[model samples]
Target chain A: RDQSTPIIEVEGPLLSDTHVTFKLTMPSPMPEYLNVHYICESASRLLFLSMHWARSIPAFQALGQDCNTSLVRACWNELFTLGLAQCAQVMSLSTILADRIKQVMEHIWKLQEFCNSMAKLDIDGYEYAYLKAIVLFSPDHPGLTSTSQIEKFQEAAQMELQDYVQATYSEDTYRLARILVRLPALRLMSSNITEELFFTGLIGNVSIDSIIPYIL
Target chain B: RDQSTPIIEVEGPLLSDTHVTFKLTMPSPMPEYLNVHYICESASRLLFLSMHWARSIPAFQALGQDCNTSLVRACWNELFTLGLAQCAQVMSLSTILAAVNNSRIKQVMEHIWKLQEFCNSMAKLDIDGYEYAYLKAIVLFSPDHPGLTSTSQIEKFQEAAQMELQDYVQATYSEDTYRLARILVRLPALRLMSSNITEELFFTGLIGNVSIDSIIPYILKM
Candidate 1:
């Protein structure tokens, strides 16, 4: 659990799911056959996996309780939404929508456009992890008590990611800025709309925000 | 092309096609209308996946071409049979066999039941990808093939596959001490399965059937 464990030691197995089947048919992805059970189960599974992923990180464990709880509670929607964007390519979910609901459909359309853009990015694992880290420690998450500590972590993430993109893509001078812009747009995404659209059917009248902590 | 690259990273559909539907009803399996075009194409796709999967593995790829070619070519039938065994879980070929008023399909039905039994038993283990991968590796990397020049190395790889699978089951399924024995014991069933019927029923004239053995060199050339 030491913070100074080499990045090599820290990264690998924390992300690896030892039990889940990795036999993905990616280039030939089988479309997710959507249903209530499937959507709910998959959403719940991914949400918890994101939780466990944060739990697994040595740095996060070192920064626990309220800061940890607030970071996760604040950012789970963005993290989960990002997962949808990344997986959008792999699981084509062109299922029947809750049709003709104007407000719901507008938000849904926004998510669709965002996911489609992300798919084109073909975001690599390193970039995705950094994006999630940046989102997780954003310091402005309303209730985070240790705002300065979170700021420190956020700055560290920004520095490491900027340094990485610079070294990795020396010719693409605007790459770091392009990556950070997604962060601004990401904050505009509304979790209430997300839960209403995706999870309302599964949980009935309850807010997903309430259930998330209990599930954890 | 990296040695440690994940295989599932490939994007697109499952291997099933329009003809056989590229068909392996695995991750979950079944069949198209059991016919010449269906049988030949389905088997061919499964055969190719076995090759592609062999190509994907780091340890398997690191071996000499002679070892690679020999292990895969010699054991393709067994691998093909096991793939069939796994797929047989969902496929209704056994139930379809029971109805044949004719005598030819009747004889094959007798040969089919043992396979269905093995398939059901295999399905019972709820085998995961790692177990399935190592099981195939242990089978393919066997040193006993008379054609192989590198018996010692082949044996080393087979033993390593077995050791890894052994430790995995011991570590993961400590409750089921009988699991490893059950998994290994299934191999002999694959050999016994085709004493006559599998080649005749599925591998029979693709309608105007091509020779199965003659197709090996072209695959090995790659």
Candidate 2:
């Protein structure tokens, strides 16, 4: 009932015979003093949302239910890295503030380098989605017991990219090669960002694990 | 025996009374333009070695002995890229590697480890060069690499690769290997390797002390 609270409304039919509506509440906006915390909270929420989406991926599903947390945690750094690069690109900040953030963070240069490479690759939405899936379903993540099965799903995702590239860019026969080559960049960028956040407390006292919820 | 040629030799005692020696002659040093062709030739030979290694994988062996050039060609990009990245890292391209953040280097190493594990998986499959070839083709002709006007064409090529594998397995290893080979190639396991390699390449290029302009262009076009 508070005026400052944000409300999200949803109405949809579950099926031909079923319909439902839902409402969600969000924290209200605050002054600049609170913006850093606000950004962290928002980023955390975004990561949680990604986890849900990750669950739906066929490769993640193939990793089996028990090991989701391990796989998610292992790949989280890369996911968050890519997410931050996109965020920095979209957000317009004052030169003074941006410079300060970078100086304090020390990782912005690497982050920008990643974004530059991503732009150079000129990846589209479909490719981006596939990359997310690739990162999420990594079978090589430490502690995975059923790598063989996970590997199968990972292969499926890879095939999907191959299939998509060949289907869409037959003339640009080299496109698949180009896209495949860009993936490692994302991993490196992600790891760099993770270290900055964890070691420097760039996002305050936040643990990457604090973001994930056991959402079904 | 020619001094102008690059010779690779292997020697071992097979038994108390016998010895085996193998020698190979590589192309002689030549003009830069000629070196390019020589590089390609050497790359092709290296690919054959990779194929030989892939054949030993049990999962591959389960798929039977028929050759599938389409798949081999498809997956070769990933294999080559991984090999190149590993080689570069090992050589410690100082200006590039040393300048990269430690975290990035660690992550790249992890990526390389994953690719090596993948190669081991392929090697463990016990499949032959034919199936290996088809698997490579399947990995190469991806339809989802961002900009492509003809997805159907890509799909068609993938199907052609698939058909090649299916037919070969049907004739050589029966329905089981066909089913197994079908399972084997469908797993798009190379994306992570691609991710790691691309990240390392990008990082290497960004180092102020390193000039990757010459190298990156070659890798990009590769």
Candidate 3:
């Protein structure tokens, strides 16, 4: 309880958002953060993080890719592609479907099948789009109502991953992790548990919060 | 200095290709890194530092989004439909786009024009199912030509980015940067620099192999 010196309590705006945390931190050498991609931020942050991390991870690395080349370089091309693997992992479909692209192709194919099949069911246009969009983006694509949308996503994801993997003889995990980090659902489900246990000693944080006295 | 160190130094792996050390560093006490949408090791590292300094910067406000009811969700459907923006971003697109759809259908409509235009080109390719298999999985259409693969990446990059910007409201999407990092010519240029730098730095190591670095100093070095 280093009570000889007074404790300094500094408070400002009570807010939450990670990318603003990222943009705000980009300028600094180092900044403190929740560092949890799981927390909700902004639309721009979501989009930015999604695409940024997706391509940055498995795809962006190339010894050949550096400052000199134009953005159109192959290394950058790979960077541009943040495929379905990230999504596959999030949906837990990658291992099941053999890989991301294969899964996506299947989804798209299945979507088309769904649309055609469901056409006979008497679902209206808006209802069909809503259902199609929901199911297609969702983890589950069932019944050959048609797999058009999801299948297309799967194909595109695979192509992007293939291009990325081929760029380097070795597939590194750093890129994989970077891309993996963008899925907030996955990140939250996994990371938050780990964090709660990590700081709290897993036994409990509430009781420990007081025992582990403040430092700064 | 914690100087009770071992006598032997750690040897790094023999690198087959040159590497950029500026790569992201993985952290410990790992989280369920999967669901955390916007932050990765690279971005996290940056975000970590930024948040520390956030108080001073006015623009650094920690903004919020309804990850559940997000436009990213709607955009995900469109991207998957048009076939451009890929995974991880899919959830973000869906959630973010869902929000945008409420007040910004006009902007969304404008963005779709590019998506449709791009899809039209991908539609024409006589690529076999194998290529399609790869393309659909990744959410990107095949490059029009092998030579143009990298360049075309940039050419088609804006759609994903537009979704990120107009629909999702985040500037982090590199649908553009994806194309930016893919330029094939980058390899040789980097190699050229690495080769010269390697020679210069390891002169003692390469003196015996004089032809490699020796020729460069005379003809290319200033």
Candidate 4:
């Protein structure tokens, strides 16, 4: 009864099982909540991108691709919360959630070490974008159809990063060395930030689904 | 004569200054030595690749591209040892090093004993060829060697290998068990074994009398 071409079609050997795309709608309830909804939309897009890679691993495929699975939920939550933290920093919500966000701040404080390391390198948006791609394609994310494929994506992202840094910062010869060193720090921070967000959600009585929406 | 166009050029933000390549000639006096000479050439090629990546690193760059640099020589020796050890098990080197004329064959025997222990665990993993390739690369590109100018480059390459290993193992088997078994246990063990071999060769000079390089090629078929 209904058939229309997709706005975005992600074609892949792994994603052939499911068809998905994103459209963000701001709920008018709590009229001032538009920013939160938009942030969630951004987080949702990240999840969509992550799942495209994540679902490729055989183990992840073995577990089945239900969004309700604990492992899948945990992975999505980690990605979403990491997005939210970045959003929070960018939006400067320090005064808005000053009291309520206090508990999570301790964990975020640990992430500051990583931020400081990143700042030492003075990484620009291009390098950050590649790093983000590398993080999104993490092969260790529990279940998947093919990890080799995931690693391949990571290697491609790494090479792109290498080429970008090599091309742009050639004059500052040590920049690649400096930028590469921050990756382990970024990895550690993602894990720690996820834990903090999980704790905050549990204590504050917030639904993870509301923070990170799942597609049917 | 000054205008010979270079056949190869490796332009890098870091390495734009150096133009280098290698050519090896076998010694005529050493009869039946062509095979041995070829292994050194192969070993030399591996070192050249290592330098290309390592040069981006300040620590290794500071060490300079000279093959004679103590650290560079040490690095090549480790890679040669590891490559030979891997090949030895695959080809099953039962009598390859039996006839080496050496005053300190006992120390070489000690080295071989360690290499066998290293190779045995590796064989047990049933690791794929690609994973082994990643491991070989990871071993050669270490940043923790005491005097590296920039550990960052080493860390970068190591992470790439680690990611490749993690992905390969996780896809092939249970993630935690495979990671714990293949990566956690084996990687550190290989590192420790390599360091021990280096100490034996450098500090003790125990195997100084043995022509280890000549022996390495015999252990590996190609």
Candidate 5:
């Protein structure tokens, strides 16, 4: 009912799986998804959503022109990790994976545990969005123009989550605390492995930090 | 009050895991569990119980002593695969002596994922205890071991067990045509993990895990 002729439309595949559908902004310069289909599809989509997420936050954008990308570099590991958590549900690895990446199962193994840890928390969609916001706006990172504003945004994210958990799981006392507690553990999961597995070849050794400013 | 002396006593590891315990007969001779601390620990324990389990069955014992080891080597992989599915809820890879098992997963690594991959699918299927027991018997009587001496007898045992599985499936949930096939498919999936999964899953160590040759000498010599 809302639509009045979309700008670009492509016909669907003849026989398709019943995939869940949504809409979003596409990244400006799309990376080559040719190298690794499963994870590249994952990381490239995350890159767009990550940037788009920052742009949606007015408080985040007003912090300064430089803030979004810098802030992303600070927490993209958690964001990348949090996205992996959703995949712990029913699906096939084969459609997305092959024996090509068989050599680097080290990264894949941690990805397994990362998802396992998340299943324990049972983060719903809103919790994931709030956690993404909280993880993104950091007060303490080195290259930030407005540390105070960043601090306020970060604090604001927690109270919002803190309030949501109360309204939802009012009797469950530790819900918000358990959600916040995940951040500390995320520290040990450096994005270096993620970059190596998903991005290094796609972008051909370019720095992940360098692209943050260009995307958002 | 009545009093009776038990035939055996096991002094457990002190200050240990709060494991759920039960009692059963020991195999006539036990295999060494010294190598590959985790999976050997798994395989050795499974080896005895697998034999003990087979011997307890009047039908299995009646087949004669000759049928035991040949049937075992063919299907130990399937039994171990099924065992992981049985305990997947209570015991994940992380739950078993975490750090060492963690290292074992990384080292045996490639096949570990395949093993966990199969486990993941099997776990999601969530088959019940009765189904698992039928599946175990079905695996035990496999006629495809290549090393089998008497094909006719092995096929007969397998036929009986498969019939039990089909009967159980139809009796319990007759409308669904796929349940039997779903359970049956896991036999090949478990095979994909390979006998070398013997090395990867439970026994990969410098000392070398027990071979069928080494394992046979220690099984129920009765």
Candidate 6:
């Protein structure tokens, strides 16, 4: 064999005795009837999946900020825009290996960006740590499935950020409104309290208290 | 929002009633048994890993041939050859959603290759047309599993293939060895043949059955 040629390890055949069946047995019988445990078990698989979802360039950048390695930092930025998010997923699942693997993902994303015309779309936030933190930290909130709770939790998250803006306003609603009228939409929302409420209330029946309390 | 500024969609918090716990049920009088089913799930998570474990770049490079996407292929190849095989395990099981989402896996591996991998790795065979073929074919062949009559079906498969080869060679050995050797090396036998019997002995045993009675001489009618 040529030393240059890579050696491939053969796994023999599929019908080998051991490989015939997967040894993994479900912890409990798959219920003919869905019970709490079964439902919870199924939900857990989806939860883990959702938690690690955004694992792409942006995450590597987040991971990169925490890393000291130059290669780590560079690759993190490179991958952040490359649009290959699954590589990011690989990093989040393994904390011990995160920094280095993150670098590789970033590098790969960069290569993809270079070769393809595909706009490495930004990593969407449907999967992110905060989204997971909501599930993990607040498991008792309400609803059986994650999707049901997503909107409410999201409003709650936005409401909290709204609070930060309110604090920045010094409690002067009149002055904030005046500033919002004069400035761009985002600038106005960040600076003015009344205008922020207007956007937040673009949907019907969202009382300030009902919406605001969820944030608190 | 600035036209230039891209906005990200955030997934909200867990709204599921955290306080909701099931009503506790009393223990039934009947005896309870903890029957289990550990399906050999795909460990493609370990394909990259196997490359790493072998500590050979060529090994990973070979596997990389399966990848059509360049960056991931290159990345997998690099890490695999660098002796990061175990890390491939983590990569294998993970999901990357920042990019596009598709069933990249179901279509990637050929039907036969997947079956053999599933069979050899003891992977839980999943439900699908390809998976069925892979599993059925393995069950019929694996000596350990005893497909047709509790005999290693793989041995039978091997015997069949070997017989075909012998017939082909006997018919053409006079014309060329070099051409035949090239085709023979790719037979996938080196991977498929794993019985305790030596290759020569096994082949000899197979050939021994060929007797003059079986060979019908082309008619030169006396």
lDDT of 4 by residue, A12-79 (tens): 23322221222111111212343443434444345554444345434344433452244444445433
Model 4 alpha-carbon drift over 4 Å, by segment:
A1-106, A189-213, B1-222
| Model 1 lDDT per residue over A127-153, tens place | 667667667766444445554455445
Per-candidate interface DockQ score: 0.01, 0.04, 0.01, 0.02, 0.01, 0.01
Kindly list the per-residue Cα lDDT of model 6 for residues A37-68, writing each as its tens digit. Answer: 34333322332232223232232223222221
CAPRI-style class, candidate 2: incorrect
Model 1 gets an lDDT of: 0.56
Off-target runs (Cα >4 Å) in candidate 2 are: A1-37, A84-89, A92-106, A190-192, A195-206, A210-216, B1-222
lDDT of 5 by residue, B110-136 (tens): 456556666765676677776777677
Chain B of model 2: TM-score?
0.45
lDDT of 4 at B191: 32
What CA root-mean-square deviation does each model show from the true structure?
Answer: 25.4, 18.8, 29.5, 16.8, 20.7, 31.6
Task: State the C-alpha RMSD over the true interface residues for candidate 3, after superposing those residues.
Answer: 18.5
> Which model is ahead, 1 or 3, in terms of DockQ?
3
Residue B222 lDDT (model 2): 28
Reference-based TM-score of each model: 0.40, 0.43, 0.18, 0.34, 0.39, 0.14
Question: Which regions in candidate 1 have their CA more than 4 angstroms from the true location?
Answer: A1-36, A88-101, B1-222
Q: Which tens-of-lDDT digit does each residue in A6-114 have in candidate 3?
A: 1343222211111111311111022235434322222113223333432232211221232112221212111111111112112221222232444334333332333
DockQ of 2: 0.04
Rank by lDDT, highest first. Answer: 1, 5, 2, 4, 3, 6
Give lDDT tens digits, candidate 5, residues A97-215: 44265534545655665566568667754467666766676543445655555545654555656666757875664455445534534543457767766664465667677777776
lDDT of 2: 0.46
Tens digits of per-residue lDDT for model 6 on B1-222? 122211223321111111111211111122333322110112222322322222222211222222212223222222221111212222232221233324535321232332233233222211222222222222222222101121121233323333333334446455642222222211121222222121111112322244211211110011
The runs of at least 3 residues in candidate 5 whose Cα sits more than 4 Å from the true structure, single-residue gaps closed, are A1-216, B1-39, B94-107, B204-213
Q: What's the C-alpha lDDT at position B12 in model 2?
A: 19
Q: Going through the candidates in order, what fraction of the true interface contacts does each contain?
A: 0.00, 0.02, 0.00, 0.00, 0.00, 0.00
